[PDB]
Structures are given as structure tokens and as C-alpha cells.
Amino acid sequence: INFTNINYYKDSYAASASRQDFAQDPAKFTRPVLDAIREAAAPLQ
Amino acid sequence: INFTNINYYKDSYAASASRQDFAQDPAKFTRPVLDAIREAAAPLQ
Amino acid sequence: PECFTANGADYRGTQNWTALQGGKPCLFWNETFQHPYNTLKYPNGEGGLGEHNYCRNPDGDVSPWCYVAEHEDGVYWKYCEIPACQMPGNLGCYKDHGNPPPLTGTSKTSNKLTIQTCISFCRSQRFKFAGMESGYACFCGNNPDYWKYGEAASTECNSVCFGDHTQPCGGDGRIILFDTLVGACGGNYSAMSSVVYSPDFPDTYATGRVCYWTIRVPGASHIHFSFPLFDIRDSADMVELLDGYTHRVLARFHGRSRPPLSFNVSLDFVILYFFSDRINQAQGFAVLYQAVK
Amino acid sequence: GFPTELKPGTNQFLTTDDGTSPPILPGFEPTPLIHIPGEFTSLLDLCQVETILEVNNTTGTTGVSRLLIPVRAQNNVDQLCASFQVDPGRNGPWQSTMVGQICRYYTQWSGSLKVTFMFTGSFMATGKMLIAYTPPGSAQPTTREAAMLGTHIVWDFGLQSSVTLVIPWISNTHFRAVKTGGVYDYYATGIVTIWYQTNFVVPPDTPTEANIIALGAAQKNFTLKLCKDTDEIQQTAEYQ
Amino acid sequence: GFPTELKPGTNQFLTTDDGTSPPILPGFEPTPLIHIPGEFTSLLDLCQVETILEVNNTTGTTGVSRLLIPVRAQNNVDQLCASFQVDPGRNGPWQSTMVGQICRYYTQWSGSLKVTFMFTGSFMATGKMLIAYTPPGSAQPTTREAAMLGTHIVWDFGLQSSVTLVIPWISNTHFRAVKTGGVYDYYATGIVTIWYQTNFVVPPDTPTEANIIALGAAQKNFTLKLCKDTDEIQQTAEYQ
Amino acid sequence: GYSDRVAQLTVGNSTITTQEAANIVLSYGEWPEYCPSTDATAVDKPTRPDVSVNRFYTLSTKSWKTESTGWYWKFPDVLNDTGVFGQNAQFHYLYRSGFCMHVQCNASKFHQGALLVAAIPEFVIAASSPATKPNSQGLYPDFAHTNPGKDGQEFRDPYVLDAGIPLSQALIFPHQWINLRTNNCATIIMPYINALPFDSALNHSNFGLVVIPISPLKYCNGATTEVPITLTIAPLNSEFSGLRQAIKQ
Amino acid sequence: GYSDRVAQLTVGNSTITTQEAANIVLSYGEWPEYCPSTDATAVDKPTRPDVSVNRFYTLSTKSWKTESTGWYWKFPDVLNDTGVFGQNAQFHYLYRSGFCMHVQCNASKFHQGALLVAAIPEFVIAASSPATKPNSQGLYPDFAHTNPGKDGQEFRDPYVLDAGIPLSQALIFPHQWINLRTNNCATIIMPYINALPFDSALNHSNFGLVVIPISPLKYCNGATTEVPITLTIAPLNSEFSGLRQAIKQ
Amino acid sequence: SAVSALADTTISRVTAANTAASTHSLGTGRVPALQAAETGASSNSSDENLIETRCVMNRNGVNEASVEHFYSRAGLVGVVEVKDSGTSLDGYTVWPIDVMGFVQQRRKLELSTYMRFDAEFTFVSNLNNSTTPGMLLQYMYVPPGAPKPDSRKSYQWQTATNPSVFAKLSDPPPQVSVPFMSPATAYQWFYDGYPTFGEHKQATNLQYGQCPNNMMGHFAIRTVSESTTGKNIHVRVYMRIKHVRAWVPRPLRSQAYMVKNYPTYSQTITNTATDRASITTTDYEGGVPASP
Amino acid sequence: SAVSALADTTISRVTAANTAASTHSLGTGRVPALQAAETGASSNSSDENLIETRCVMNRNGVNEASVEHFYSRAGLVGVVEVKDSGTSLDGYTVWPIDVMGFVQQRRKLELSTYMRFDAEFTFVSNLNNSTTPGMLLQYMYVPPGAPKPDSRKSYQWQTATNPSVFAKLSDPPPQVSVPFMSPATAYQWFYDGYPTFGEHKQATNLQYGQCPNNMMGHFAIRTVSESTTGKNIHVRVYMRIKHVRAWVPRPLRSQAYMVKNYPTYSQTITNTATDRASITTTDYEGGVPASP
Ligand SMILES: CCCCCCCCCCCCCCCCCC(=O)O
Ligand SMILES: CCCCCCCCCCCCCCCCCC(=O)O
Ligand SMILES: CCCCCCCCCCCCCC(=O)O
Ligand SMILES: CCCCCCCCCCCCCC(=O)O
Ligand SMILES: *[C@@H]1O[C@H](CO)[C@@H](O)[C@H](O)[C@H]1NC(C)=O
Ligand SMILES: *[C@@H]1O[C@H](CO)[C@@H](O)[C@H](O)[C@H]1NC(C)=O
Structure with missing residues (x-):
């Protein structure tokens, strides 16, 4: 029985940390290329 | 989950500030005239 | 009068103390090799430096400073409050508390403000006094009572002028006042x-x-x-x-x-x-x- | 006893804490609320009311004369009548405005401004003025040719005696800090310069110098943020 | 008064306590959130980006030269080009990597690593390298015959200039402590040695010494645990 | 979608004609109304002498000069000794009423100048004094300045409205300009504003009526020097309760 | 499922042909876009001079030597005095634009070397100074190093990017290598990145454009010594608001 | 149930006016720029009708400029010294309740003519050395007419009907909710009148502007002591105005106040705007022009 | 009702990537090992395609590496000494709000270029001897433009609009929630530009990198006192960054910082990696080989 993530103030920024939206999108840093290269393929053919 | 705006006392004036009724009616100060003047119109015609 | 420059880069006046009362002693220049300014990197004079703990301004800072013993939290130097280093036209550093201003007159904020650009701004309007503040604000006035909020330490007016970082231009709530005859x-x-x-x-x-x-x-x-x-x-x-x-x-x-x-x-x-x-x-x-x- | 744990912020008195407190008067019913005309519920409604800009804030000019922009018959062409910065919270002409004083109770402002110029010359006095708003980055235009490159209105004196120059919200940031000067010229709004588009022409036996009254206000998209304490009146002792 | 009992931990300030606190600004609406490119929501996404391993962290080697693995034509066969430990948080070549610096903000790490070697010689320079990962328990292999008994890749230089050697997650524990040395060599990851499978063969009038650039990163199964404070920059006085 | 320059204001047996009128300012968008049963507190039946008191009273004519500072009136005080309104204001303890203030200043098309006609609720008049003890007389305005009567009072410091508030922001109040090139009259219809449903017409002045020259009256030699400013006001929805002996002040 | 080595980049009247290309880095997977209505704050209608400003400007050619440290440009600053882009950047207070940075360095199959072409958002240039007082000039970079213009600036300490950050982690930024055995060009398409929808093209430089030799240029006697590095950049989706007098700096 | 009410308790964002896209206008009879300020009305000219605007879906929150948010902030309304040392061995002080003694609260209130509000009064009491030793204080509200205490032992402190707060200095600041206490519908920061009938011919004329509808009694504070404590206690009273209803906005005060209950400015009138050199001089340097 | 929301409030475990079982591959054209690092893309090679892997149903929690968990930790952002003894009898201190004065918080923030966040500021104040006597302090936030106090008695402490916290040293650390206060969409730890137009030809060039969008005013702290207390109070400010939005990740700082508002490293550049004897020397002894 969990009783947390409760805001006691009318201002939304007084709430606790937003710790329920873990999203991992590494492609914008790891594969930031136009031509999607398959793993099994030689990249520069 | 918000838990606020709660009065703990039988007197209604012990409640918190009334911060949920933002109303903006500037016409009583900006256009306090009898003849409503259109924007596109020359006022004194 | 011991200093005739705005920054004190003319002072050779035998003061080995950050303040004449309630300050810190100065480290000798022939012994401050841990720091950029010493007698080794400046052999012959070169800024009034030598075998003495006297306050000097060799780096072209806003006020004569000196190396102090580094103990507090790494503070290894301090400006010297030399009361005789006031420029002959420098009327002093005074406090600015509010809307009745030290110099009642015209104002000017300039990102290129120097001591002279403020004086020249006030002299062009026949004002006797020119007051620089916060490094960018210039105030003019004929008020004989620019001290209405009390005097302040010269070191409290050690904010660099935005147009010449070698000149003092007051500080937060502190105004440095010059006679507009200067220059x-x-x-x-x-x-x-x-x-x-x-x-x-x-x-x-x-x-x-x-x-x-x-x-x-x-x-x-x-x-x-x-x-x-x-x-x-x-x-x-x-x-x-x-x-x-x-x-x-x-x-x-x-x-x-x-x-x-x-x-x-x-x-x-x-x-x-x-x-x-x-x-x-x-x-x-x-x-x-x-x-x- | 219900188990509780006191957290930081316990026993503190935050002056901006909208919380409950015990009522000193049990069962107190106040005097009934009758209708009073002129209720304002938003300070932005007050900022949209046009108030006189003190454009003639010059040495020697005293009293109501500080509210007048002098306009006279010019001997040369393309001359400058008046200029003023459009930073609402800056020490200058906008201090005399309701928008410029309510801005000082806030840290950041946003939205278009509005200066309505009213010509108070004789009916026989004719003239055309170029009122230009110069967006930031440029100093006050030195010529009318340089000022007409910005937001401007060519005002023709006539039966309608007033012109409105909107200072559009041309800013890089969503808000501008009310504080100006120093590095806060990053939030400079610009400069409004009044130029003689044509001359100030009058017939004989007519006054040759008239006045323009500037009326600054805020547009409908005006917004304030981060309520602070103004720096307009200072106090050294409790008023007894 | 509702009966309550204060428990231990009352009045304490835990620096990692996700709790509420009163807002200093009633009714504050911040500047709108516009889209900014390049938002990262996970530090593991940063650890998967390949960054240059400082494999030439040797005395005398200065600057960008510390990022190059020198490869030259060998007079003998089965020789060692370079070696480095694959402990991400150990003082060594992995310090220069984003994974090796984000690892230091955590106590325990897990998952496969990845070193992409890029050959930066002439198009005419050909060669085959044996890049071997030696799992823990063994020192650096003294011969290529001993290194080829571990996880290795025979890299052939060619049109594709880069090879990837995955350091597989070969561990007894689910996590390895980022701290190394002493009894914490229990969490040793292993040693990666680069051997000359064949020689570095070049035609005449061609440079005989080239460079391999190692690019270390983390695989998709990489995971960090127990956020701590890194030991990379020290401070003796508040930055003024 | 425009304001007609001609206007006729018929209240009681009084009628005001203007041919160069800007508009009619309805103060705060609220017409004068009689006190509702919900807002009333006094139990006596009020007297509503409709046409005998609700009518235009031309009260004062002030000569606008080049160096004139301005004038101010206090609305109940300016009518407390005039007509049947004054009698009801003296015989009755309680009073409430709106008004239709009509300031008139006509000048030739060769004159220039601009008046600021504003109706200031609760126009507390300030005194301009040096730093003095609270015993000092100069710290507080005399009764001639607080209640100027029908003659009005010449502003001492129109820049601060003789109230410490900047004249430039007096436009926050229901106002109208008399710009001599544009209009010769300023009409302001003000409803009864008070924290009380009724109040004493003698003690309390609900509104101030300021007429300040912002742009000074300038003309050339040969133009008519005497340029008057006339204040015609008309009570609107005047009620009076609490009948007793007539009290002057 | 591979990247073709041939590529043609046609923007405006400019076209760039490459026959040895690795790929095209789309910075953070986001194409340059015009400022949406939701993210905009300035009310003036922006100018979008599509083909006159969005085009490839070949700006600088730097001779790669064996001991070369590298070069960096600041994207708005490098085009602020060039073409119709520069004029719009000077006449308008506000500006936003992506770019298509194309670095070109061709060498024979007997040359070797590797450049790191990275586009660094908010590339604040550091100064390398001894321990000195905040009064010291060496603590802060001069304007020639913060805004190098179109000529660029030779790196002093490419190992720390002249920013105190390790060059080895500069690959966290949108980057591409010019490995002379593999490719002769590096293309980076960078969208407008800023905490603001628009910003001054003169004051603020949104991105740094670093070209650092990681593997030094080595060749044998007889090979062409002069191996140039050319920077061709193209604005993409350039908007300009706040028209005024043209301001240089 | 009523869980729907607790859900809609956070402040919702009301945004500013959006700007519509506008094009060029070349014609006659349509003059949105020409106004008539004589009419007493502010200009209805919009940005779209004077320049070519874009579509700006404005998301700037206007909610903070409300009268509630502008006023619901605890400011200093009174400093009451409970002198119990030296020549003043009283141990008690009866303080006339007035919120116009300090400039910051006074200037904000005088923005409006009439204000009807409840208040949250907070008492931040301490010694001269800022220390708060456990010392029992009694903050008794003495409404108009209730007998004021004349000593630290007098019978009025029995507070059988008067509201009273007992709190040590060591306790967090005592905080109470005060209702709208006034015979009038609203408080009146400006009362153009006199409280009593008469001639008002005094040389001082102290009664002008004094509305007893605002005079809400006294705050009697004492150390709950049997003799002199030798310590002076400084009670700082902070009023947070809640449930605000403001009427008739006024110009913000420009002259420095001189007294508490009277508008009274110096003969040296301070200009609302600071002086500059000339009407054509602005101190904004901008950048270097491309071609002068 | 909303009891479903309170049920799903505990942090759910997001696990790492599972490893699939892989077999041997003997063929042509399938080269998952060969990459092209020139393309600027990290290698897409998986462990399954380079070695024979097993099926590992990975249950390692990746949830702690989030930007929220990495940043939502109160670190020291400011040490403010309220000097009231010796030569500095001020009893107050106005502190420029800057979070870049201490290495641990500064290096974590500079991982990102832009950060938009709310903060939980905590004030841990005490004397030099670590003791916390009951001493009333006032922590007033002075936003940019609000008048800064010039004494312990000045009018600015009336805090009619400024946020202010009154708390004794004996109280638990004052803790408040600060919103995202910035004219920009996000804070900017790196600003490649100048705040003002001009020539920027000064010998010092102090304005490079100084974005006023980050300058969020001052924290004015005073002892609520009438004279000197003779005691210096050390206020340590701890900022917990919550509701974090980070953009444009950057290399973590490798050189030691020298100043607060400028990237400035020594001429003695420290290598990111520690030096070893040779490129072929690793200091891992391992075990005794079976047959050398
Ligand atoms: C137990 C202690 C309780 C405190 C009681 C406080 C009562 C305060 C009265 C309400 C304040 C607002 C009205 C002030 C009006 C006076 C100003 C004036 O017109 O001079
Ligand atoms: C009552 C006391 C309240 C405390 C108010 C604290 C306000 C803090 C501002 C928010 C901190 C983040 C922004 C810091 C950016 C400055 C760093 C820099 O760029 O130099
Ligand atoms: C005060 C009562 C609060 C009730 C909050 C809801 C808790 C639900 C209990 C089940 C916990 C959720 C996970 C699960 O389904 O096992
Ligand atoms: C103790 C339980 C109190 C529950 C209060 C109601 C909260 C409802 C949760 C949803 C928040 C409202 C805004 C929304 O619909 O997203
Ligand atoms: C300063 O110098 C003088 C030189 O005579 C010496 O007597 C004195 O002791 C010195 N003081 C300090 C603090 O070094
Ligand atoms: C510096 O000079 C002073 C004055 O002659 C001398 O007393 C002192 O010993 C010198 N110190 C060193 C380190 O030479």
C-alpha cells in the first residue's frame, strides 16, 4: 500500500521528483545518421 | 494527486487564499465609454 | 596625496596592511614566488615591486593590492584601503541606498562606461560631480550632500568600469564620485x-x-x-x-x-x-x- | 499517536505560503458585501490603461511640463522631435505610467506595449510625424532614414488627434527582465524616436509650438511574472 | 489535534530524499517548454556513444597523440601492438571515455563493453590484427598463442576501416564494482591485447607507421548502480 | 461604430447641448443606480426627489490662463449649498447619488491646450510640508482645501494632484481630455462609489473633480484672452434618508 | 542496408558532389525546421529568404600539416559577413537556422591521417592561464578566439578542445571522421539548438565547428605536401525577424 | 465523492492573448491606428492592425498578476517593542493596529481605494540579539472599546472574550486568521471626509481622512511575568492579505510618505521620472552600425 | 477512485537488454563486426553476432541511470557567511545565486548544455563551532531588479513581495521549492556568446559566456537583530534538482576549474588518463599460468 507522490501545494513544481518516466532513446546519439546501416551489412559499400 | 485547499476550521475565513478565480475585465478601465468605438473606425466622426 | 592615478598604479607609499585598522599584513614581493607578481618575474622595479610588503598595483587592477597569507578559504590577496591613495579629483566612495539619490541630476547606463566617459557626460551638462556605480551606471549632480548615506571604504567601490577594467566604477549600492573638472x-x-x-x-x-x-x-x-x-x-x-x-x-x-x-x-x-x-x-x-x- | 516524521521546512515562516491558520473570532460573520463600482481583479487590466509618459524628463523641466513632448515649426527637414527607451521598468519616461510602476512589482514582463500620442496644438496646426520603434541591437537612430527601417507609424495630425504606436513584442526570450542596465541590456526593448515626417505648419496668428502627450500602456498580450518588491519609495523610519 | 508520534529520522536532512517542499512563488508559471534537439533522459544512452580510448597513456606522449595506438611494419611475427585493461572506472585508458566517466558516478556496473578500433593508415596499408579479450584470472597474455584462447577478433584492414571487439559480460557477479585495485581486483574485467596477426604491409613510398584509434563504449545491456560522487576533479576553494 | 460629436444631455429641466464632444465616459461601466434592498442597511424609506435634485447645476466658471495649475471640486461638497439637492443634503443624514459631470471649455480653432478632466473617488487632499513634527499645521490641509465648496480650489501641485500620486497616472480614474483642437466638453457619468450604501453628504466627499491643464493654454495676440472653464454637474439617482433638522456643515 | 559512398547535396544554387563519403550525420536525429507557432515568441512575421541564404557557402581552406592542431569555427559568426545570409543576419535582430556543414579533405591513397569533424553546440572557448587573479587578461579568451570569423581559429590545445573538456569525449557531439583511407568529406546536418526560438546571429554562436587531426597527416617524400581542408556550410531553414539598421557586431 | 474537488485544486494556467497572423492593408476608411484619447478610452489598436504579425500561440501565464497573488504575501505591518528594561519597565505594550506604517505594504494597499479581505497575521518576536529564549508572551487583540491593559498584571489579560495567543519566543511564529473586521463593506485607505460633524477649523486639522471604519483596535502584547524581565522584545507583525476584493484602482504613490495616516509630501517634490540630458538622448549604445 | 494512482507510485524496475542465444556463423557477406566509425555512428555490433552467447534473461535495473535520479540529489551550491563579528559587523549578506561555485554540482550540471528544472533549496546554517543556537535568520530571495538590502535594518527586509523564510538555527534546515525561473526555455551552463552588443575588445573580456538568462538574483540572509551579535553564521545552500530536462550532453570536465563563470584551465594540462610505463603494460597479475 503506497501513499506517495502527493502534492500538498497548489503549485505543481512543489511536487516530488518525476521518477516514473524512464525513457531510453540512444539512437539520437549512437546512430545519428541518415542512411540506416544494418548490423550484418558492410557500412560503406 | 493534489490534497490542498482544505479548511480545517469551522470559520470560512481561516481558509487559504482564493487563488482559482482569475478574471480579467479591463473594459471598465480601458473603454469606459458609452459609444463603443470600433477599432477600424475613426473615433470622432 | 600619494596616488595621482585612478587605479593606484602610482603608489609607492609604505603601507604593508590591507587596512590601516582591522586588516591583514601583506606578503613581501621578494618572497611571493608562489604567485605571478614577485621580484623574480619583475627584476628591476616594474610596478613599485621590490623587497617590501608595501601595497602595489602592478597588474593594473582597480586599486592597490597586496598578497596576504592564504589561510581563510584560499583568499591569497586583498585590496589595500590606502586612504592617501585617493585621486586628487576622487571625492570618495559613498553609499547609495535609494530613490533620493546621492547625485540628484541626470543618469546614464553605458556598457562602455569609464571614469572619464561619466565625467565627460556630467561636464557636458554643467554638473559639478560625476558618480560611477555598478561599473555601468553614471550619475551627475550638483548636490553638495552626495554623502547623505555615509562614506564607504574605497575597496567597496572596486567594481571594474565596463569600458576600462583598470578603473574603479563603484559597486552594488556604492557610488564613486569625481569632480567633473578632472580631464x-x-x-x-x-x-x-x-x-x-x-x-x-x-x-x-x-x-x-x-x-x-x-x-x-x-x-x-x-x-x-x-x-x-x-x-x-x-x-x-x-x-x-x-x-x-x-x-x-x-x-x-x-x-x-x-x-x-x-x-x-x-x-x-x-x-x-x-x-x-x-x-x-x-x-x-x-x-x-x-x-x- | 499517528506516526509522523517532521521534514525540513518545519517551523519556518514563509511569507508567501498560502496555508490555513486558526481563526481568532469563532462564528464571525463580516459586514455584508455590497456592490462597489470599479472592482479590479487583475493588475494586467490596470497595465492596459493608458497613462502619461514623462517624455520631457529633462533638467529644468518641472511639473506638468515634464509630460509634454514639444513640437514646433522646423526650419530644417527630417529632424528629431523626441526619443525614449521602451523599457517599462527602466528609470525614465515609463516611471510615470501605471504599466511602468506595476512592472516594477514584477521581475519579468512580456507582451506588446502601446504609446498613444495625442497632439494638443491648434486645430489649424497641421503636421506629419514619423514615430519609429527601433528593435534592440541598434542605438537611437541618428537620422529619420535610419529610423524608418524599424517599426514605425507616419502620424498625420487631423480630426482624430491621437495615434497609437504599438511596440510589438520583438524579443529573443519569452520574457524580458524588468531590470535594465549592465548585462541586463540583454533585455533592452528598443528606442522610440519621433521624427518630423513633414514640418509643423501653421497659418498666421497661430501658435508655432505645440505639445504631444504620450500615453503609454500595455497591449492585450501583456504579462508579468515573479512578483518582487519595487524600488520606487524608500523608508528610513516607521511612519508615525 | 490529531494524535501523532514523531519517529526517528525526524528533522534530518537527507540529501537524497524525494519529498515535497513549499513553493516560494505562488502561481508561478515558468517560461513555456519549447522543443530543443538533443534531449537525453538516461545516462546509459550516453554510455553507448563511442568515445576515444586513451590507450597511449604513456610518459612523454602528450596531447592528441595519447589517443593513438601506433601500428607499424614489424620485423618479427606474432608481436604485441598494445594492451589495456577493460575496467571502465580504473585509472587508465577508459578515463577518456564517456562510459568510463559516467561509470565513476556509480559504484557498480554491469553489461558488455565495446571497443571499435579504427585504422587510420593509408589506403595502401594492409594488415591483420588479433584483438583478444582475456577474461579475469589471467595476466596480460605473453604470446599471441596465449591470447587467442580468449574472446578475440581477427581484424582485417580494408574498405571498412573499423572493427568492433565486444568485451562480453563475463563475470561471476551480476555487477562489477567500479572501484579497482587491492581486493577489488576481484571485480577485474580483463585485459584487451592487440596482436599482429600478420604484418603491417605497405607498398613503396607509403608510410610504414600508422595509428589505430580505439573507441570505447557500452553495449545495450550496460547498466549502472549506486550513484556516488566521482573522484575526477578535486576542489580546494570555492570557485570565485 | 463611432462616437458622434453632437450630444444633448437632458436631466430634469436642464439640457446641455454640445457640438464638439469626444464621448461620454461611463465611470467603470456602471450607470448610477438606486440602492438595492440587498445592499441597503438603513430602514427608513429614502426620498427620491427625482427632477428637483437630479438636474444640471452650473456651479463654477474658472478662467483658464497660461500659468494655471488646475482646479478640483468635491462632488457632494460642490452641491451642498445649491438648489433642492443642497436642502435634501442638509435635512437628511444619509445621501447617495451618482453624477453627470460636464466640464465646458470652448476656444477658437487658433487656441491650443489640453485639460485633463478626471473624477477621482476618495480624493484625499494632501498637504505639502517640510519635514516637521506632527504638531505642525502645514502637515494637514485646511478645510478650505479639503472641501473647497462650489468655487473649487486651485491646485498647488497639479503634478502630484495635491495627493502625492503622480498626475500622469490619474488616467486610471474615469477621465476625459478637453483638447481644444478636438472637443470643448468632457462628460463623466460616475455611479455612487463608497464602502457604504449611504453616507453623509456633509462629512464625506465621495469623488474629486479635477480639471488640470496638461498642455498649457497658448494663443497669439488678438485671440480672446479669457477662456473660461465651466463645471456643470448633475446628480443622478439621488436618495436621502434620515430626515432631521437642516445641518450646514 | 548500407551507406552509399557517392552523395550529392543540392541546396539553393549550390551543389556538392562527393564520391568518397561515409554517411550524413543528422544531428540528434532532427532535421532543421522552421520555428513552430507553439515555440515562437516574437510576433513579427519572420523572413524566410529560402534560396538566397540557404545555400552552400565555401568559407575557408586550411592547410593540413603534420603538426597542425586543428581549427574551429562558430557557425553564425562564420557566415555573418558573407552573402545574403550575412545581410539578413545584420539587418535582423533575431535569427534561427540549421546548417549542413560539409568539410572536405582529399588526399592520395598514399597519404594517411584522420580528422575529427564535430559540431559542438554552445562551444564556449576556454582560456589557458596560470593561476592568476580575476583581473588577469589570460583568464578569458579574446574576441578573435570566441568569434574567429570566416577564417576560423587554430586550436591551441586540441586535446582539451580549448574548453577544458577532453577531446576524446567530443564524439558525444554530432561528429564525423575524415579518415583519408576511407572518405574525403564529413557532412553534419545540425538543427537549430538553443534555449530560445530565435537569437542574435551576432552576439550568440549556437554551434562550434571543430576539425581536429587525431591521426596526424603523414606521407612520404614525393606526395603532395599541401593537403587542404575546406569548410562548406549551408544554412537550412533560415528565419530572420526584427528588421532594423544593419549592425555589424 | 468530493475527490473531484481535491483534484481541481492546483492553479490552472491562464495564458496571454494570442497574436493572429496579419497581412498588409492598403485602403481607405479603415484606420485602426487613429484614436481619440480625449474620449477617456485607451486605444483599441491591436498589433495585427498596425504591423504584419505572425501567429503566436501565446502560452505565457497571466495568473500571477491577479489581485490575490499580488496581495497574498506576508509583509511587515508593525514593529512592537515590549520594553521591559531601563527607564521603561513596562513588560507590556498596547499597539494601535495600523497597516500604513511601513512603505512596502502601504504602497501596495494604496493601489486600491477599497479593499475587503481576510488576513493571516504572523508575529515574529525575538530579543535584541535575535535570540528567542523561552519566554511566554501574550498577544491579546483588544477590539475598539475593550479595555486596554495598563500593566502586565491588569485584569484585561484574563482575555475571557478577547482573542489572545500565548506563545513562547522559542515557538515558531504565532499565526492566526483575522476576518474582515469593519463596519463598512470594505476597508478604505483613502477617506475624503471627516469622521465627525463640525466646523473643522483647527490649526492642525488632524481628523481629515480619518475613517474609524478602518480603526480596528489594538494589539496588546505582554511578557507573562511577575516583575521586570530586563529584556526588550521586538514583535514584528506580518499581515498576509487573503480573500482580497479591491475596488477603484489608484495611481501608485510617487512621493515619499511623511506620516502614517495622512497623504503628506515634502515641498521638495520628486519627479516620477528621473531626469535625462535632453528629450532626444537615450542611453542605449547598441551595436556598431553596418553603414552610418 | 484515484486510489489507482496511489497504487502505481512505487518505482517499477526497467531491466537491461537480454542476451539471446547465438550459434556459430560461417559464411560471406554477413559482417556484423566490420564497422565504419567515420560515419559518426556508434557500432551496432551485438554480443550475439561476435561470440556464441547464451540466453541471459537480464534482470538488472537500469532505472537509476535516469537523468532524474542522477540529478535529484541535494548538493552544495553555496556557502554564505553572515559575518557579524570583528571587522565585518554586518549581520547580513547578499549572495549572488550561482550553482557553479562547487565542483561536484558544477561537473554534474555541465554534463548537459541546457537544463530546465525545478529545485528544492535547503539551507543548513550553523555557527563556526557547528552549534545551532536559537537565532532568528531571514533568508530573503531578491530576484533580479529587487532592491538589495544594505544593512540588517533596511526596508527591503519587509519582504512584502520577495519570498522570505524566517527560521531559527535550532530549526531543521529550511527547505523550499524553487520553480524554473528563467527568461529562456532552459538554463544554459554554456553560452557561446556575449550578453550585449558591441566590440568586445577589452583586455579582460569578462562578458564572454555570461548569459543573464541564468542570473537569478541574490539570496539575502540576515540575523533578525538590532545590533551586532558577535557571531558569524555559515549558511550552506543545497540544491536538489527535480523535474529535470537535459539537452545536448557534453564531455564531462577533465581539467580542474579555476573560476566560477568561465571555462578556464591551467597551462599545465592534466591528461584525462593516468600515465603508464608502456602501451603494452597492464598491471593485472592474475593467477599462476598452468603451462607458460
Ligand atoms: C491574537 C492577535 C490577533 C491579531 C488581530 C489583528 C487585527 C487586524 C485588523 C485587520 C487589519 C486591516 C485593517 C487595517 C486598517 C487600518 C489602516 C488605516 O486606514 O489607517
Ligand atoms: C527564500 C529563499 C529562496 C531561494 C531562491 C533560490 C533561487 C535559485 C535559482 C535557481 C538555480 C538554478 C539557476 C542557476 C544558474 C546560474 C549558474 C550560471 O550560469 O552561472
Ligand atoms: C491509504 C490507502 C492508500 C491505498 C493506495 C493503493 C495501494 C494498493 C495496494 C496494492 C499495491 C500496488 C501493487 C500491487 O498491485 O500489488
Ligand atoms: C488522498 C487522495 C486525494 C485525491 C485527490 C484527487 C487527485 C486526482 C488525481 C489527478 C490529478 C488531477 C489532474 C488530472 O486529471 O490529471
Ligand atoms: C611595515 O614596514 C615597516 C617598515 O619600517 C615595518 O617597520 C613594519 O613592521 C612593517 N609591518 C608589517 C606588518 O610588515
Ligand atoms: C625581502 O627583503 C626584506 C628587506 O630587505 C628582507 O628583510 C627579507 O629577508 C627578504 N626576503 C627574501 C625571501 O629575500
């Missing part, structure tokens, strides 16, 4: 002793200044002309002490004509002349006359 392109001087400066003195004198200062003490016998500062290193730019009634040259000073310690004149009416070429502008001069009745 004027001439003027009448009828007084016993006054330190007449080069045109636009805290800055470098402009190219093309032909200025005439009238120094007539009505009743004096001899005028003791001394030059505590003559950074006039050039050829065409010359400082002449023209006579009065006769308007005849009495002493001409330029680069290779540096003036004696006292070029006294027997005339009670002298005309300090200044010339400036179209190039090679220097820091200027700061003459000091003393009338002997």
Missing part, C-alpha cells in the same frame, strides 16, 4: 592648489586636443608647478606652461623633455597648454600647482 579640455583655475589633469585623464588623452588651463591665483607671488605624473611618451604631443599677460612659453615638456620636480614661475597668471597629435596617445599628465602668496 577637462581646459578651464579656469583660481585656487591655491589644484591638480590639473590631462584631457580625459583616467583614459588616454584624445587625438587632437588643444587645451588651455588658466591658473591665476589673484594675489600669489610664485606658482610651484610639479608633475606627479607625466606619461606623455610621444613627440608631437607636448605640454607647455605658457605665460599669462604675455602668453609667452616658459617651459615646454614632451617625451624627451620630462619636467623637473618643480618648474616654479614668478607669474601669478600661468596658462597650462596641451597639444595632442593625430596618433600615439598616451596616459597623459597630472600637474599640481601650489600658489605661494
